[PDB]
Amino acid sequence: GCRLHNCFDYSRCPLTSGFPVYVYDSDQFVFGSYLDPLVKQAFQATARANVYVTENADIACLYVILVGEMQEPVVLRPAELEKQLYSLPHWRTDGHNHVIINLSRKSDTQNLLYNVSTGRAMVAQSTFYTVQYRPGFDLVVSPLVHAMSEPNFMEIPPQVPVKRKYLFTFQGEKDYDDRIIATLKAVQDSKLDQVLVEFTCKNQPKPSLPTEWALCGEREDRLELLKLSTFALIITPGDPRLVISSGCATRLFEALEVGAVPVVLGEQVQLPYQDMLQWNEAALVVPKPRVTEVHFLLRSLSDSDLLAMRRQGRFLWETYFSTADSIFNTVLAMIRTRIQIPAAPIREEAAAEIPHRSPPYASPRYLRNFTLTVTDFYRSWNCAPGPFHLFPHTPFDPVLPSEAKFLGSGTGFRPIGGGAGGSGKEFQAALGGNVPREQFTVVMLTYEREEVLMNSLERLNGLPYLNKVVVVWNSPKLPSEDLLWPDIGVPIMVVRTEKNSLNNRFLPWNEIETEAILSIDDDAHLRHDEIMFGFRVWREARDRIVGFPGRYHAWDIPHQSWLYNSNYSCELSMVLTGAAFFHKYYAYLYSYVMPQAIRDMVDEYINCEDIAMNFLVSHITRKPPIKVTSRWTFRDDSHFHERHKCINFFVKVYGYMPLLYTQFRVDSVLFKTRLPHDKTKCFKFI
Amino acid sequence: GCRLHNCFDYSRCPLTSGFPVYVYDSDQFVFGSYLDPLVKQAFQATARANVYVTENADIACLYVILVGEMQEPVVLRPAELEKQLYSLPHWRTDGHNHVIINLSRKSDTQNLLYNVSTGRAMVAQSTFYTVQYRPGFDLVVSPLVHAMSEPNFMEIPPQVPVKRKYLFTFQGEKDYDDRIIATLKAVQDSKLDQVLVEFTCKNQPKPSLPTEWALCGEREDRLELLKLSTFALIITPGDPRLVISSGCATRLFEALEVGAVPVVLGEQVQLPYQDMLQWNEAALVVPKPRVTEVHFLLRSLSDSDLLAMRRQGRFLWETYFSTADSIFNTVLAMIRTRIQIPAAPIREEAAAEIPHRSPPYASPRYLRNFTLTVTDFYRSWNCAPGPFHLFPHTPFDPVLPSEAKFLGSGTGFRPIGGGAGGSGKEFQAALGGNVPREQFTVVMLTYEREEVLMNSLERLNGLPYLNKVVVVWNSPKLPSEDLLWPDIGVPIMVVRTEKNSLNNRFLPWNEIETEAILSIDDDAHLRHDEIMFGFRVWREARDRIVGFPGRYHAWDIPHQSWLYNSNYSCELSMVLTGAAFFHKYYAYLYSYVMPQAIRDMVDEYINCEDIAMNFLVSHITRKPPIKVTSRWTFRDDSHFHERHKCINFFVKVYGYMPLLYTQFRVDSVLFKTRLPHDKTKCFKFI
Ligand SMILES: *[C@@H]1O[C@H](CO)[C@@H](O[C@@H]2O[C@H](CO)[C@@H](O[C@@H]3O[C@H](CO)[C@@H](O)[C@H](O[C@H]4O[C@H](CO)[C@@H](O)[C@H](O)[C@@H]4O)[C@@H]3O)[C@H](O)[C@H]2NC(C)=O)[C@H](O)[C@H]1NC(C)=O
Ligand SMILES: *[C@@H]1O[C@H](CO)[C@@H](O[C@@H]2O[C@H](CO)[C@@H](O[C@@H]3O[C@H](CO)[C@@H](O)[C@H](O[C@H]4O[C@H](CO)[C@@H](O)[C@H](O)[C@@H]4O)[C@@H]3O)[C@H](O)[C@H]2NC(C)=O)[C@H](O)[C@H]1NC(C)=O
Ligand SMILES: *[C@@H]1O[C@H](CO)[C@@H](O[C@@H]2O[C@H](CO)[C@@H](O)[C@H](O)[C@H]2NC(C)=O)[C@H](O)[C@H]1NC(C)=O
Ligand SMILES: *[C@@H]1O[C@H](CO)[C@@H](O[C@@H]2O[C@H](CO)[C@@H](O)[C@H](O)[C@H]2NC(C)=O)[C@H](O)[C@H]1NC(C)=O
Ligand SMILES: O=c1ccn([C@@H]2O[C@H](COP(=O)(O)OP(=O)(O)O)[C@@H](O)[C@H]2O)c(=O)[nH]1
Ligand SMILES: O=c1ccn([C@@H]2O[C@H](COP(=O)(O)OP(=O)(O)O)[C@@H](O)[C@H]2O)c(=O)[nH]1
Ligand SMILES: [Mn+2]
Ligand SMILES: [Mn+2]
C-alpha cells in the first residue's frame, strides 16, 4: 500500500546536497554466498565505479542491497531472508529509503520476495504479481544478460534493408489463446508474406511460470532467427495476476538487440521503465481481440516509420539494457527523478598549462538544473544522449521571443540599432539576433610546425569577439624556450597532451569558458570578415556545424559501399572541422559518450576525426551542416583510402548512415546587391 | 474492476469502418427535465454538429448519454437513475460500449454516480473516488465553464513581462496542513518577493467536499487576482480516497486561462487527460514534504523556461478546456486512440471550375494513418495543432536515410549522377536530395488585371517540374468569353470565389494535388532558374516558408509597440507570400484551425494576409523563414499603417510575438566560384 509520498523520507535529501548512495557489501551477509557469481561480480564492479556512491552511511538518502538471483535450487527460506533484512545495520525499524535489487540472469521461474515482508523498502526486479506490485514505488528492470561480456555492435545486422526474410516470427510452448493460434497458423498458410510460427520447442523448453509461453533453446538459437525477422511477436501470459515476467522481458531484450520491432499482444503489460519511456515509439502494443487484424496492420506501415521505430529501439537498448552499469544507473536515475533531484555534473578535462614568454566575458553555467530533470522529462529520457549526466549548456535551450528583451528580460541583449534595425553601420555595431551577447574561443592543434603557428596566431590580432586562444601541444617534446610567443590582446594558453591523437582537439578543456568553439588548424588562412559572419550564423544555428570547407559522400554500386569525395560539387554532406564552429556540448559527447571504438580507430588511423564529428552531430540532430562562403581551399593516396575505410566502419558501428545532403550555402542578406547610396552593405567581401 | 480489454466489445469497431457515434437524446428520458439548461443546450449543440455522430444506432461503436449536472437539490434517487440507465434501448444487458457523461458547471459537491451501478459503461466526470475510478477505462474531463459564451482572447493578459506583481497567490478555506500554512505565512512575512496567501474567504465560501479547500467568491473575483500572479498554487485534498475534485480542476482551468503557472502540492493527484498529456511541461508538481523548499525552487527557475511553460499551458487550455466542443471532441479522441482507430480526415475546399478556351505526377496521400494516432502519440497530443484531424501529408514526416534508396526503398528517388554526384550537368538532370521525386503547383490571385495575367501566365511556359496552375478569380464578375487563355503545356484551372478576400489564396483547393504550393501574384516577374533553386531549398526545408521578398519588424520604444518595415536591411523576420513556397498543410491550418478573428480582420482590412501566414508558421515551428536571392523588387500611407495595426492585433491574439530574426540568405554552393574548366556551375545567374 505504500506510495512514494508516505513510505519515503525526504528529510535526508535536500535538493542542494546531491544524491549520495550507500551500497551494502553482500559478502558481509548471508546472501553473498548463494548469489550467482556473475551477477555479484558485475554489480560489485559497477557499484564500485559509480559516482553517486559513498562510504559514509550517515548522510545517504538511499541504501542498496543486492539479494539478486540465487543459485538454484534456492536454499534460504523466506523467513530467513526476512530476518536477515531486518538485521541490517541501517534498517531502521521499517527499512525506509531502501531499495532491494533482484536481477534475473538464468532462471525465469524464481520469485524470492513473494512470501517476504519488505516493510517500506522498494523492490527492483523483472517479475511481479499484482499483489506485490506498487506502481510509482517499485521498479521493473531488465534482466542481466551481458554479464562479464561486451555488447559489441559488430554482430548486429544493419538497420537497412527494412524488410527482411520474415515478416514476423515466434517460438514458444505452453480464452483467447486458441483463436490466436488458429489465426497465426492461417496467416502462415496463406503465404501472402513469409512468416515462421512455432508453438512447440524442439530444444527442451526452458522452465516457465504456470501460464507463460516458454522459451525454446539457447539464446543464440533465437538470435539466429530474429536477425531474419522484421517484427518480433510477444504474447503476454493468460494469468491476469501476472503483471510482467522475466521471459517476456527477455524476448523484448533479444528483439531490440537485433532490430526486430516488437509486437506485443495485451494492453495490461507493464514494460520496463514504462513510467519514463514511450514504448509506443519503439514497439507496437495490440489487444488480443484485434489479433485478426495484425497481418493487415503490419502490412500497412511504411518503411520510414518502421525504420524510425527500429532506430529508437536500438537507442533504448544501448542506453538502458545493454550492461549492468546501464541498469544500475537507470535505477538510480529513476529514483532520483521521482524525488526531483538533479543529476551529477559531467567531468571536465583538467589540463596542465605549459608556461611561456610573450573584455573577456564568460558564459553563465548550470541554469536549468530542475528544468532538465522535470520539465524536459520526455526529451531527457527518450532523446539522445540521455538523462544520466548534467551539462552546463545545451544547444537545445529555449530562446526568448523578441518582446522579452524590451520588456524586462533584456539582460545581455544587444539589438541592432536599438531595435530599429539598419544597414551595415548598425549591423556591425551589435550582434543582434535572438540570443544575448556572446563570445567565442579558438582551439588549434600543433605538431612540428612551430613557425607557421606563430604567423597564424599573429593573424588573429584584432578579432572583435574573441575570448582566448587554446593551443593544443600535440607533440611529444615541449616547445623551445627561445620561442617568443606573440601578443594579440587576449590570453594564449598551451595545454599538454598525454599522447599524440587527433581526438585531443575535441576534448572539453577546462580552460574553455564559452559555448562556442572555433576549431582551426595551425596552417589555415581565414579573413576576419568570414569568421564574424560564421559566428553570427552559428548564433542562429547553435545545434549545427557551421564551417567553410565542404565534402560529400557517394555510393559505389559495384561494391555496395560508400566513398569519400572532395571534388567541387553542387551538394554537400560534411563540413570539416579544420575550420568550423560547434558547441562544446558535442566535445563532451565525443570524448565520453560516443563509442570508444571510433576513438580507438582514430588513434590507430591518425586520420578521420572530422568525419566522426559530422556523424555524431547528424545522428543527434538529423540535420545537415552549413557552409558559409565560396572558398574551397584555405592555404595522398593512403590518406584517401583510409577515409573510405573510416566511413564504412563508422556506418557499421551506428548501424546506418546518418549523413544528409544539402544543396545550398548561406551568404549575407545584402550580398551582391545594388543598394542606393543611402545604405551600406553588411560586409565588403561577404 | 473492468478494464478496456475485458469490458469493451471490439467486434463493433473494425479499423477500416470509421468511428461512428450515437448520442441518446436526453429530452426523451427522465434525465432531461432536471438537467442544467446551459449544459444540456451546449452539449446538444456540439453533438449535433460533430462529424463522427450518426443516427443509425445499429452500426455505432459508442453510445453517449448525458446525465450531466442536475439542478440542485438533486431530485432523482440513485435507484431511479440506475433503473433509467438499464431501460435504455441499446443498453444490452451489461451496457457495453457506453460512456456516461457528467459535466460540472456550478456545483463542486455533486456526485450522482457514487451509489449507482454502471455495469460495463465508462464514466466521464471531473470528480472521482478510488472506489469508483478505473484507470485506463474511465476519463477525467474539465468542468464546463464557457457555456453559451465565447472564450475570447482579448481579456487575457500578455505572456510578457514574465514576472508579475506576485510570485504566487492562494485563496481558500477549509497532517501536513498546518506545516504548509505556517511555511507559506512565513514566506509572506519574509517579503523576499511579494506573495498573497489567504486561508479565509471574505466572500461566503462556496460549498465543498469534507476535506477540500473551498473557493472564495465569484469567478471574476479570482481572475482579477490571478492576472497579477506568476504562479498559481493548488493544494490537493487531505483525503487519500479523493483522487480528483471539481474544485482543483476549476483552479487549474482558471490558472491556465490567464497564464499563471500552476504549482501543485501532492503527487497522488490525477489531472485531466493525464494519460495523454505531459502536465510536467505546463505545471509543477511538488510533494507536500518539500513545501519548505518551494520558495527557493520557484526563485531558481529561469525566465525562458517559465515562459515556455506558460505558452504550453495556453495551448493546452485553448485546445482541450476552452469550450464544450473541445471537451466532447477530446473525449471522443481519447476513446478512439485507446481502441487504436484513426481520426476523421479534414475537409477540403470543393470549388467550381470556370470553363475557358485555349507528365503530371500526383503525390500519394494518407500513408501514416496508424502511425500518427499511436507512434506519434506525444507530438500529436502535446504539439500544435492537435490530434483531432487527419492530414494527407505533413512536413514533419520522417525522411529515409541515404542508404535506403540504394537498398530497397528507392521508389521515386532520383539521385544526382546515379549516386556518384557531380557538377551542374548532373545536378540539373535530377532533383537529388533526401526525398523522392516531386512536383509543385502554382496559385495566382487576380482582380481586374486581365491582360497582365495573360502575359505572366505565358512566362510560365517551360517550367520543368510544374504540375498545373490554379487561377483564383477573386473578381465579382466572370471573365469575358472573348478572352483567349494561353497554352503552357499544363492545365490551367480557374476557380470561382464566393466573395473577394485575400484569404482565398490560402484555401486548400481540391484541385491542388501536390504538397508544395508556389504563391505568386499576377504581376510578379520571376526567372526560371530562381524558381528551381527555391524548389530545391524547400525540398530540404519543407517545414519553412521559402520566398524571395523579405521584410522585418521593429520596436517603437516611445510607444512600446511594433512596426512594419520594408527598407533594405541586414536582418529579416518575414517573407511575403507574393512569391514564396509553402506546404499545403499550412493552408488547412490557416483556413480552418487558425482563429477566425485574424481572417475577419483580413477581410475587413483587405491587406495583411501574408503577415498572418508568417505568424502562423513561426508559431508552429519556432524557426524563421528563408530568403533565396539578392533581388528585392519583382516588377501608400494607408496601406502602410494598416500593417502596423495588423501586427499589433495579431500579437494581441497570439499573446506574444512569434517572429524571429535571420541574418543570412541562401545561395547555390558554386555561386561566384572560380571553377576549373573540368567543371560547370550549378546555375548561371544563381
Ligand atoms: C572526384 O570524382 C572522381 C569520380 O567519381 C573520383 O574518382 C573515383 O574514385 C573512386 C575512389 O577511388 C573510384 O572508385 C574506386 O575504384 C577502385 C578501383 O579503381 C575500387 O577498388 C574502389 O573500391 C574499393 O573501396 C571500397 C570502399 O571505398 C571497397 O568497398 C571496395 O571493396 C574496394 O576495396 C572504388 O570502387 C572511382 O572509380 C573513381 N572514378 C573515376 C571516374 O576515376 C575522385 O576520387 C574524386 N576526387 C578527386 C579529388 O578527384
Ligand atoms: C525605413 O526606415 C525608416 C526609419 O526607421 C522608417 O521611418 C520610420 O517610420 C515609422 C513608422 O511610420 C516612424 O514611427 C512612427 O512615428 C509616428 C510619428 O511620426 C508615430 O505616430 C508612430 O506611432 C503610431 O503607430 C504605432 C504602431 O505602429 C502606435 O503604437 C502608436 O500609438 C502610434 O499610433 C510611429 O512611432 C518613425 O518615426 C520613422 N523614422 C524616421 C527616421 O522617419 C520607414 O518607415 C522605413 N521604411 C521606408 C519604406 O522608408
Ligand atoms: C546546478 O547544479 C550544479 C552542479 O550540481 C551546481 O554547481 C555546483 O554548486 C555547488 C554549490 O553552489 C558548488 O560547490 C559546485 O562547485 C558547483 N559545481 C560546478 C561544476 O560548478 C549549481 O549550483 C546548481 N544550480 C542551482 C541549483 O541553481
Ligand atoms: C487512411 O485514412 C484515409 C481516410 O480515413 C483513407 O482514405 C479513405 O479510404 C476509403 C476506403 O479506401 C475511401 O472510401 C475514402 O474515399 C478515402 N478518403 C479519402 C479522403 O481519400 C485511407 O484509405 C486510409 N489508409 C489506410 C488505412 O491505409
Ligand atoms: O600526426 C599528426 C598530424 C597532424 N596533426 C595536426 O592535424 C592538423 C592537420 O594537419 P595537416 O595540415 O598536416 O593536414 P592537412 O590539413 O595538410 O590535410 C594540424 O593542426 C596538425 O598539427 C597532429 O596533431 N598530428
Ligand atoms: O482588392 C484586392 C486587391 C488585390 N488583390 C490581389 O492581391 C494581389 C496583390 O495586388 P497588388 O499587386 O495590387 O498589390 P501590390 O503587390 O501592388 O502591393 C494580386 O494578385 C491582386 O489580384 C485582390 O485579390 N483583391
Ligand atoms: Mn593542413
Ligand atoms: Mn503586386
Q: How do beta strands B665-667 and A665-667 pair?
A: antiparallel
Q: Which three cell numbers stand for residue B14?
A: 473494425
Closest C-alpha among A253, A225, A271 to residue A326: A253
Describe the crossing of helices B637-654 and B609-621 by its angle, rounded to 10 degrees: 30
Provide the shortest C-alpha distance from residue A502 to chain B (in Å): 28
> Residues of A forming the annotated binding site for UDP-N-acetyl-alpha-D-glucosamine?
445, 449, 474, 500, 505, 521-523, 609-610, 643
Amino acid, res. A379: R
Q: Which three cell numbers stand for residue B322?
A: 476552452
Describe the crossing of helices B37-49 and B324-338 by its angle, rounded to 10 degrees: 60
Contact predicate A74/A96, CB 8 Å: no
Question: What is the CB neighbour count within 10 angstroms for residue A678?
Answer: 8
B78: enclosing H helix or E strand: helix B78-86
Q: How far is Cα A312 from Cα B282, in angstroms, rounded to an integer? A: 26
Alpha-carbon separation of residue B118 from B8, B85, B124 (angstroms)? 13, 8, 12
Q: How far is Cα A614 from Cα A610, in angstroms, rounded to an integer? A: 6
Instruction: Judge residue B93's burial from the number of C-beta atoms within 10 Å of its C-beta, 0-12 exposed, 13-18 middle, 19 or more buried.
Output: exposed
Provide the shortest C-alpha distance from residue B182 to chain A (in Å): 18
Q: Based on DSSP, count helices (H) and strands (E) in chain B, helices before strands.
A: 19, 24
Distance B417 CA to ligand 1 centre (A): 14
Is the N-terminal amide bond of A385 cis, ω within 30° of 0? yes
Torsion sign, CA atoms A545, A546, A551, A552: positive
Is the N-terminal amide bond of B345 cis, ω within 30° of 0? no
Contact predicate B66/B31, CB 8 Å: yes
Residue A563's DSSP bridge partners are A554
Amino acid, res. A533: F
Distance A614 CA to ligand 1 centre (A): 22
First to last CA, chain B: 69
In chain A, what residues touch B432 (CB-CB under 8 Å)? 571, 661, 663
| Residue B59 DSSP code | S
How far is C-alpha A619 from the geometric centre of its chain's CA atoms? 10
Closest C-alpha among A230, A216, A281, A218 to residue A258: A230
> Which residue has cell 542508404?
B403
**3-state helix vs strand vs coil in chain A, percent to 5:** 30, 15, 50
Contact predicate B173/B201, CB 8 Å: yes
| Residue B26 DSSP code | G
Alpha-carbon separation of residue B612 from A168, B541, B591, B594, B649 (angstroms)? 49, 20, 11, 10, 10
Q: How far is Cα B683 from Cα B686, in angstroms, rounded to an integer? A: 5
Q: How do beta strands A166-171 and A229-235 pair?
A: parallel
Q: How far is Cα A446 from Cα A452, in angstroms, rounded to an integer? A: 10
Q: How do beta strands A574-575 and A550-556 pair?
A: antiparallel
Distance A515 CA to ligand 3 centre (A): 18
Contact predicate B548/B577, CB 8 Å: no
Q: Where on the phi/psi map is residue A215: left (φ > 0), alpha (ψ -120 to 50), or beta?
A: beta
Q: How do beta strands A516-520 and A579-583 pair?
A: antiparallel
Q: Which three cell numbers stand for residue A596?
A: 570508444
| Residue A591 DSSP code | I
Just list the catalytic residues of B. 610
Is the N-terminal amide bond of B385 cis, ω within 30° of 0? yes
The set of residues, in sequence order, having a beta carbon less than 8 Å from that of A608 and lying 6+ positions away, is A502, A601, A602, A642, A643, A646
Contact predicate B618/B545, CB 8 Å: no
Within 13 A of B262's CA, how many CA atoms are on the CB side? Answer: 30
Q: What is the DSSP string of A179-209?
A: HHHHHHHHHHHH-SS--EEESS-SSPPPP--
Technique that determined the structure: cryo-EM
Question: What is the CB neighbour count within 10 angstroms for residue B673?
Answer: 16
> Which residue has cell 496463406?
A190
| Residue A366 DSSP code | -
Closest C-alpha among A39, A674, A677 to residue A327: A39
Contact predicate B388/B329, CB 8 Å: yes
Q: Which three cell numbers stand for residue B238?
A: 487531505
Contact predicate B233/B179, CB 8 Å: no
Nominal resolution (angstroms): 2.9
Question: What is the CB neighbour count within 10 angstroms for residue B322?
Answer: 20
Output the CA angle B178-B183-B187, nearest 5 degrees.
150
Q: What is the DSSP string of A86-108?
A: HTSTT--TT-TTEEEEE--SS-S
A476 — phi, psi (to 5°)? -60, -40
Alpha-carbon dihedral of residues A470, A471, A477, A480, nearest 10 degrees? -100
HEC string of A373-432? HCCCHHHHHHCCCCCCCECCCCCCCCCCCHHHHCCCCCCCCCCHHHHCCCCHHHHHHCCC
Protein residues within 5 Å, CB atom, of ion ligand 8: B 521, 523
How far is C-alpha B147 from the geometric centre of its chain's CA atoms? 22
| Residue A504 DSSP code | G
| Residue A528 DSSP code | H
Within 13 A of A225's CA, how many CA atoms are on the CB side? Answer: 18
Contact predicate A678/A591, CB 8 Å: no
Give me the count of residues in chain B: 686
- What is the radius of gyration, based on Cα positions, of chain B? 29
In chain A, what residues touch B569 (CB-CB under 8 Å)? 421-423, 669
Contact predicate B611/B639, CB 8 Å: no
Protein residues within 5 Å, CB atom, of ion ligand 7: A 521, 523
Instruction: Tell me if B153 CB under 6 Å of ligand 6.
Output: no
Q: Where on the phi/psi map is residue A433: left (φ > 0), alpha (ψ -120 to 50), or beta?
A: left
Q: How far is Cα A257 from Cα A253, in angstroms, rounded to an integer? A: 6
Alpha-carbon separation of residue A373 from A249, B263, B300, B305 (angstroms)? 27, 17, 14, 13
Instruction: Tell me if B500 CB under 6 Å of ligand 6.
Output: yes
Is the N-terminal amide bond of B161 cis, ω within 30° of 0? yes
Q: How far is Cα A87 from Cα A93, in angstroms, rounded to an integer? A: 10
Q: Which three cell numbers stand for residue B613?
A: 501566414
Nearest-atom index, ligand 6, CA of B472 = 24
Residue A286's DSSP bridge partners are A265
Q: How far is Cα B80 from Cα A282, in angstroms, rounded to an integer? A: 49
